[PDB]
């Protein structure tokens, strides 16, 4: 049986991928870059703050100063942080709280493998911190998603090998990171976005312990 579940946060535990998108789109348009639509944003999900800004700047081959780059990232974060202040336990996606309780009851470790430095704050907002055995610090890894490092770190933080873990993800970059870690990915979203080569569920209510067990078996 699998021994750990490695959770992405944004777009898996709650609808904060929507808020990252809105904040990045607003920032892009302030600097005159209009290509950040929902389709392009699939390339941004799971990606670090700095890599997200760089991918946006790459759209118009746009060149800002180092000072401007830092200020733009800060501006986006300040906006995002304001948008999430009213997140509450009511915003936890369907099925997720039950899954956490069921994993815990079955002595399966629970780790966060989010690229977001706002992850710990969001778990507190949602009253979820006590369910997590570990949070992998996205600033500590040498390589961010789509590199596997954060998933490897999350597994190791709970004393489990990635090969004994399931990873839950809503993003292309994160699914790739799970694949390259050795853990088993189960995506949530559209195969059109996430691929036709791994198990994908249409919504988080499908993330039941019972379903995870069967995926593991097969
Ligand atoms: O800017 P933060 O909060 O550190 O988040 C970093 C990244 O965190 C990931 O969880 C999100 O999918 C990305 O959209 C985001 O860019
Ligand atoms: Mg995500
Ligand atoms: Na406008």
Author numbering: 1 to 218
Sentences from the paper on this structure:
For complete catabolism of both trehalose and maltose, the isomerisation of βG1P to G6P is catalysed by β-phosphoglucomutase (βPGM, EC 5.4.2.6, 25 kDa). βPGM-deficient L. lactis is unable to grow or has impaired growth, when the sole carbon source is trehalose or maltose, respectively. βPGM is a monomeric magnesium-dependent phosphoryl transfer enzyme of the haloacid dehalogenase (HAD) superfamily. The active site is located in the cleft between the α/β core domain (M1–D15, S88–K216) and the α-helical cap domain (T16–V87), with closure of the cleft through domain reorientation occurring during catalysis. Two phosphate group binding sites are present, a proximal site adjacent to the carboxylate nucleophile and the catalytic Mg2+ ion, and a distal site located ~8 Å away in the closed enzyme.
Taken together, these results confirm that βPGMP146A can assemble a stable and wild-type like βPGMP146A:MgF3:G6P TSA complex in solution. The 6-phosphate group of G6P is in the distal site and the trigonal MgF3– moiety mimicking the transferring phosphoryl group is coordinated in the proximal site between D8 (atom Oδ1) and the 1-OH group of G6P. The donor–acceptor distance and the angle of alignment are 4.1 Å and 174˚, respectively (compared with 4.3 Å and 176°, respectively for the βPGMWT:MgF3:G6P TSA complex). The catalytic Mg2+ ion coordination also has comparable octahedral geometry to the βPGMWT:MgF3:G6P TSA complex and to substrate-free βPGMP146A. Together, these data demonstrate that βPGMP146A is able to populate a cis K145–A146 peptide bond and achieve full domain closure with concomitant formation of transition state geometry. In the crystal structure of the βPGMP146A:MgF3:G6P TSA complex, which mimics the transition state of the phosphoryl transfer step, the K145–A146 peptide bond adopts the cis-isomer and the sidechain of K145 is able to engage in the active site. Hence, conformer A remains the preferred route for phosphoryl transfer in βPGMP146A, despite it being ~1000 times less stable than in βPGMWT because of the trans to cis isomerisation of the K145–A146 peptide bond. In addition, assuming that βG16BP binding is diffusion controlled, the increase in Km for βG16BP in βPGMP146A reflects the energetic cost of the trans to cis isomerisation of the K145–A146 peptide bond.
